[PDB]
Symmetry: D2
Subunit: 299 residues, 4 copies
């Protein structure tokens, strides 16, 4: 667990930009990668939930993976979310991530169909084998996956050979603390941005988040406030992140983030794929004012 | 709603046979269609959940759809489950179903990501458009999709232009009755085989089910018993169906069904796709005895 | 299970009438018991959830039990819901029901606090002991108790020495059928009036319900329709019951029932105890119209 | 919200000691109050969930209320949990708390029966009126009450006239932050001991908890650590608190705490009321070792 310490940190869950016809916008994808590097992030998490993975084909996900590796390999840590319901499809994306030079792969607990815990473990084992020597990030998101793992099951997942981290998109900070106590060296990512400060305090040593794409310096600022023992500053930063998250929940989270990035002249086209609707017109002024606030807050 | 009475009835949710390398077993697929026709079913529902749709590519789902149409068009009713999370993927499968001559399409409420009710309606509207004049079956399965529709939302979905039926995989038989009372003409399929008789009594006029692939005549028998007013016979048939479903839950439902069909010399290979494990050896004897029992019962 | 067949049937879950100051209305309680006897019911279930047991003191519940025994002992079957969270409180009510001559006691699974299955079993054993020879009805209502029993745990409860029946307030009619199949002689009451017909078909042999207080003959008629094999009549009667239940849900179920009974000249004051609010004025005309319809419906 | 700052702090949810026959052990109750005062706590919360309020009579709860006031009035803050399902019963306990000189009352959202939000509000208004001048603490515990309040409803509850605080027994630290942000002056108690440190960081300014009865100085130490910016010390204290909570979850929480207190020579008899079972013999060694550790840690 200590030989993959380079995986710790704050890493945006990269959005996948699409063009006006909902195809991959490669030029905007490259700009978004460069924008995140310039924000000072530790890494990027590609083709996750926030990446709209589950409305893309395998070929599209591979194209995105390869472009991001071109832009970012050697500059920041690269984690490829390869997870699919199908084990064989996940293996194909893991083998591709290996060829592109990613530092780690990740896979969401396979969803829709009920699978036994043993089926989950063999799924991770098969993907780890196809990753062919780069570590696995187990990705736990019970609210969307419907997979309700016990603590003892999480303990077994994160000790499988080849697993180097846990992305913990759970609001249960008792379990966060229990995972940390059971695995003092484990790379443990907070997945709910709206509790980032509290999740670090409960044992996470970094985070993977959708909203880091537009204000990663606030989350980096919370990491530093807590190291410096400035708890009032950590709370103030989290209050500001959550004011933004309240707005994003009102307008649509992924499309709201893409719209801000469009007003920051990063993404040419801010659409999500159907069935996500476009942003309602009445919310544009607020999203544009947020973009301008965030740009001014950097200098 | 009156012009789609030809969609009523008992229709197996067709399994998708795979070979030893987990590719589509076309020969076994054709024999499973013929086998279901020979059982006297009213139709087949292709590429659904039971069909392992969500561990298949679009290309594979199209291949299955086209094969089934070749075997069954003009002999029994053909319903194509074209549903994906992506609207555009679902539309591609709907346009393909239209080319192959299917009698209706169907789509599960798109899952994993939370979508507004308005986003769900526009998803169905777009698929109905690509289906280009064949009716849509709305497919409600809250336990796996995570979409919890109210009665009033269901009422709006089943009256969208182009919607001709509802696949109701819900054990809430108060809602089943309310849907029937609000739409006396609606084609309404019972989706949980283990309550078929009660679901008919609560208002369903047919059923779509995984276990109909191995014993459709029991469910046709329940329809008949209730029409005849032999409530005791309906109960006894459901008891026997549920003894089977108990066994299938113990061994794994889709792989148990495929194993029974392997022991009936229908499918050459009884595998599901990973991450479904194969059947445990200790259950083979029971599954073989069930196939023997069902074959002697047939005649 | 053979020697308690006299418990089978259709039994209203008796409302507890209160007066203007929210004290027990003894005269209206007597009139409601008599009204139910004249409706032809098989028994009465006293001091249950519908009886507002959990906003009453033990002394008040005992006074209600004794009165119902005076009015109904030897005329219809008498079941006393003695259940509390506390085991000793429940035992006090069971010992009292024994003194008053009840034919059976009943206890809801103790709630609010999480208790282990063994703690639940010991709770029932102690109450059965204090009931001193009259059988126990296990009362299962997960939606309000939060106790989620497995099928195998239900199998152990209904086989405790002294248990003669199960009140099954669950809409899961697979489990209903499984209970019937494992216990062919068990007295099994359908608890959700809105699926009564389907619940009988799935294996219940009677019911306990709040709405039987105002229209027991429809549920008795459903029993008769199914015995006769008139499945269409059973459905039509269930439709009519559910039209009423729809209204009761809109206005508040217990207070709406009490208001109907008020307009039938049975109850002097149609209030529930606080924090239940009174019925909104806008619903009075509907409730009065339903009272008239149910009265004309009888003769 | 500012004129009740004397309610902020760290307050054990007092256990109710019972004797060998399950009646109130008055002598052990007095020594438990004194023990907590001597731990440096800010107040005590009397007759709550932890106090086994819902297996006691109104008369028993008043006896405990009156004894605690006699021991602690004017030494530490006194909060009386007067909550019942019944509004009238809750009012009776609030009038008593007022007579005994309590500083505040509290009530759990009424449970078991579904009540509307307006019925909850009127319940609190009525108790506040009977409390006759002392502030009300709204007490939120969705996991046991089943009352799932939105954020906007919580906002309306804490702005009711006479409401001075919220006991927030929720693990959702997004909502915790949102409440703090919407009400910067609100007295906001963290209810889940196992996330205390994180709950403070998310906006709580105190806590009410069952495990404070045996180790309040750890929780006071966490407050001090977070004020001093020693995040690492706060984390270590929370780890130790959670090692204890793990053991208490394994043995049974209330009875485990009382057993520890017995081995601390505080409680003569460590029994909870039925249906809580006694502690298993095989856990006694661990609970005794824990008692010894906590005693030696104090100094
Ligand atoms: Cl290749
Ligand atoms: Cl490359
Ligand atoms: Cl699982
Ligand atoms: Cl830290
Ligand atoms: Cl820029
Ligand atoms: Cl084409
Ligand atoms: Cl929805
Ligand atoms: Cl029918
Ligand atoms: Cl006595
Ligand atoms: Cl008597
Ligand atoms: Cl349990
Ligand atoms: Cl029958
Ligand atoms: Cl009168
Ligand atoms: Cl008095
Ligand atoms: Cl509510
Ligand atoms: Cl603080
Ligand atoms: Na890095
Ligand atoms: Na047909
Ligand atoms: Na009787
Ligand atoms: Na104080």
């Amino acid at each position: 667990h200590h030989m993959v310490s380079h995986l710790r940190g704050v890493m945006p869950a990269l959005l996948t930009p699409f063009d006006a016809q909902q195809n991959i916008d490669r030029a905007s994808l490259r700009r978004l990668v460069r924008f995140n590097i310039e924000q000072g992030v530790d890494g990027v998490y590609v083709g996750g939930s926030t990446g709209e993975a589950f409305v893309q084909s395998l070929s599209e996900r591979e194209e995105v993976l390869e472009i991001v590796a071109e832009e970012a390999k050697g500059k920041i840590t690269l984690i490829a979310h390869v997870g699919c319901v199908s084990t064989a499809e996940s293996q194909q994306l893991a083998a591709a991530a290996k060829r592109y030079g990613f530092d780690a792969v990740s896979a969401v607990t396979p969803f829709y169909y009920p699978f036994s815990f043993e089926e989950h473990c063999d799924h991770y084992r098969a993907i780890i084998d196809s990753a062919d020597g780069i570590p696995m990030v187990v990705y736990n998101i019970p609210a969307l996956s419907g997979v309700k793992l016990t603590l003892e099951q999480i303990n077994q997942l994160v000790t499988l050979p080849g697993v180097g981290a846990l992305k913990q998109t759970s609001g249960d900070l008792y379990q966060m603390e229990q995972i940390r106590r059971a695995h003092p060296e484990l790379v443990l990512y907070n997945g709910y941005d709206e509790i980032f400060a509290s999740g670090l305090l409960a044992g996470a040593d970094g985070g993977i988040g959708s909203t880091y794409n537009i204000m990663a310096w606030r989350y980096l600022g919370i990491v530093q406030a807590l190291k410096e023992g400035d708890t009032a500053k950590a709370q103030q930063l989290q209050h500001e992140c959550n004011k933004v998250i309240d707005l994003l929940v009102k307008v649509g989270v992924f499309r709201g983030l893409k719209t801000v990035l469009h007003y920051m002249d990063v993404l040419s086209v801010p659409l999500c794929r159907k069935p996500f609707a476009p942003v309602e017109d009445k919310f544009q002024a607020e999203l544009k004012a947020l973009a301008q606030q965030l740009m001014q807050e950097r200098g």
